[PDB]
Amino acid sequence: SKSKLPKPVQDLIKMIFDVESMKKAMVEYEIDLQKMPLGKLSKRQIQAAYSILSEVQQAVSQGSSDSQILDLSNRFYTLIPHDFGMKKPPLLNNADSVQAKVEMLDNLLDIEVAYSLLRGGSDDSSKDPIDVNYEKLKTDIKVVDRDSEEAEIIRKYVKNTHATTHNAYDLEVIDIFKIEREGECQRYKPFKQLHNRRLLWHGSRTTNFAGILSQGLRIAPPEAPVTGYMFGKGIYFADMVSKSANYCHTSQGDPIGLILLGEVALGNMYELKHASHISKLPKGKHSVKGLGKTTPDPSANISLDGVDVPLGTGISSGVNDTSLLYNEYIVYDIAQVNLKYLLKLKFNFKT
């Protein structure tokens, strides 16, 4: 049977469940697909690699020499087989190297979720595989009409918050989907009337979306080192579309990406200017706000279904001596997020 879902929804389902895209992410990470194919990836293997990556960063912080670092770095490559032929693998000594591996493991965890959905469950050739994969997401997905009110506001948010420092590309909104993850509205109930509820961006690689729609935005596992995240292990958002769009990791070889709009209950924000690898918030705080030098103009904030949308053009925030060019918002309880929209974007690279 043929799917009756709208063509943009079918194309969205096709992109997020693409096995060749999952394999392409694993080749980007120099993973040996003979020793670690897509089907042999498992949570316990990724969690054990996160634990070794914590032992690696623990020694870097404790001023250990390259002789001691070598043994811990080699251990990481044992757990996550990389394809280096008969050469020694790149030494994980610097912070930029260890940071990249924590981020690789974050993507691998979501890839394992997506592939587990495709491989678990049933096979029925009489149904359209698009319809079958759609149901695995347990998310109602509707197309938002271009000439509707919510679409005008969303397109204005995209139009106004593209940073001048991210000028290597411009964005075109292809499709706007209104999404409703089953059980999420009920989970959000304790926070639905909290103050400082804002509609914020969350960008991610396309290969992470089957996991985000099936399980919602999650916090990194306990094995993951708290130092591998600027503000510790939470759920990150931005008010500048391009800061979030950069996390799609699109390129001229793959210029289409996906970005989320989520209602986030920020409440009492813990304001910070530099990295703070916290395990828990201070008492009475509900989120972290990383203070950027630039913020969408606060006077241009508008309300969409009771939620504040900071869609104003970027202006100076008045914040001096901060590590951040733009704001970032972090929550440490998954129940503080209610996903609202999912956009498909075309990145027009100007380089």
Numbering used by the authors: 661 to 1011
From the paper:
Poly(ADP-ribosyl) polymerases (PARPs) are a subgroup of four enzymes (PARP1, PARP2, PARP5a, and PARP5b; PARP5a and PARP5b are also known as tankyrase1 [TNKS1] and tankyrase2 [TNKS2], respectively) that continue the reaction (PARylation) to generate long chains of linear and branched poly-ADP-ribose (PAR) on target proteins. PARP1 is involved in repairing single-stranded DNA breaks making its inhibition an attractive strategy in oncology especially in those cancers that have defects in additional repair pathways. Thus, TNKS activity promotes Wnt/β-catenin pathway, and TNKSs are potential drug targets for the treatment of cancers driven by Wnt/β-catenin pathway, most notably colorectal cancers. We determined crystal structures of the catalytic domain of PARP1 and the ART domain of TNKS1 in the absence and the presence of the ligands.
The catalytic domain of PARP1 includes a helical domain followed by the prototypical ART domain. Structurally, the helical domain is placed adjacent to the NAD+/ligand-binding site and limits its exposure to solvent. The second difference is in the nature of the donor loop (D-loop); in PARP1, it is longer and more rigid than in TNKS1. PARP1 D-loop has three proline residues in its sequence, which likely contribute to its rigidity. This water molecule makes hydrogen bonding interactions with the imidazole sidechain of the catalytic His862 and the backbone amide nitrogen of Tyr896 in PARP1 and analogously with His1184 and Tyr1213 of TNKS1.
